Design a protein around this ligand. Structure first.
Ligand code: HEM
Ligand SMILES: [O-]
Length: 153
């Protein structure tokens, strides 16, 4: 898992996100949808967003980015002890939303990108390593639940 030091870096980075949760969440989803338009198709409520300008102008997209990063933050603050928090998300994303684990890889990559973009020169090599490890742990634990359920997508 992650060391004590590594969790400290994760939660330090997370403080940056928390100062503007909606702004970070918006930019994460925009990066996901523009880089991987197939992901937009999983959201009936964002399918009407035909341009990045429309995406930026959508208050509902910001609202969802808030929901998404708030959930992730709750999970990260558990420092790996997140079975209760993670299980329902795994189950809704596999059985209801039909989200392949590839799409979680995409959003993980989008979070790293957004952190650099919003905090250029203030997201150090150690911090990137730690955040990357935490997102991998999150994805790996979801993947285990996906395997239980026989879900591929
Ligand atoms: C950091 C990873 C993610 C987190 C923490 C997360 C969290 C959430 C939460 C808390 C909800 C609302 C409750 C629920 O339905 O379980 C939700 C809904 C949803 N999620 Fe995610 N999600 C993540 C990644 C993704 C990805 C990558 C996609 C698609 C590419 C996706 C698709 C959806 C959809 C389609 C909904 C329902 C949206 C609606 O209200 O119409 N999720 N997610
Ligand atoms: O989501």
């Amino acid at each position: 898992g992650l060391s004590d030091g590594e969790w400290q870096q994760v939660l330090n980075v997370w403080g940056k996100v928390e100062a503007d949760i909606a702004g970070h969440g918006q930019e994460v989803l925009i990066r996901l949808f523009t880089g991987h338009p197939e992901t937009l198709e999983k959201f009936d409520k964002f399918k009407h967003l035909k341009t990045e300008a429309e995406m930026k102008a959508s208050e509902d997209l910001k609202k969802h980015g808030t929901v998404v990063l708030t959930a992730l933050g709750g999970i990260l603050k558990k420092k790996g002890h997140h079975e209760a928090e993670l299980k329902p998300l795994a189950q809704s994303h596999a059985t209801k939303h039909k989200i392949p684990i590839k799409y979680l890889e995409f959003i993980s990559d989008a979070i790293i990108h957004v952190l650099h973009s919003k905090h250029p020169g203030d997201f150090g090599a150690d911090a990137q390593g730690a955040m990357t490890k935490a997102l991998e742990l999150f994805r790996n634990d979801i993947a285990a639940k996906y395997k239980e359920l026989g879900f591929q997508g």
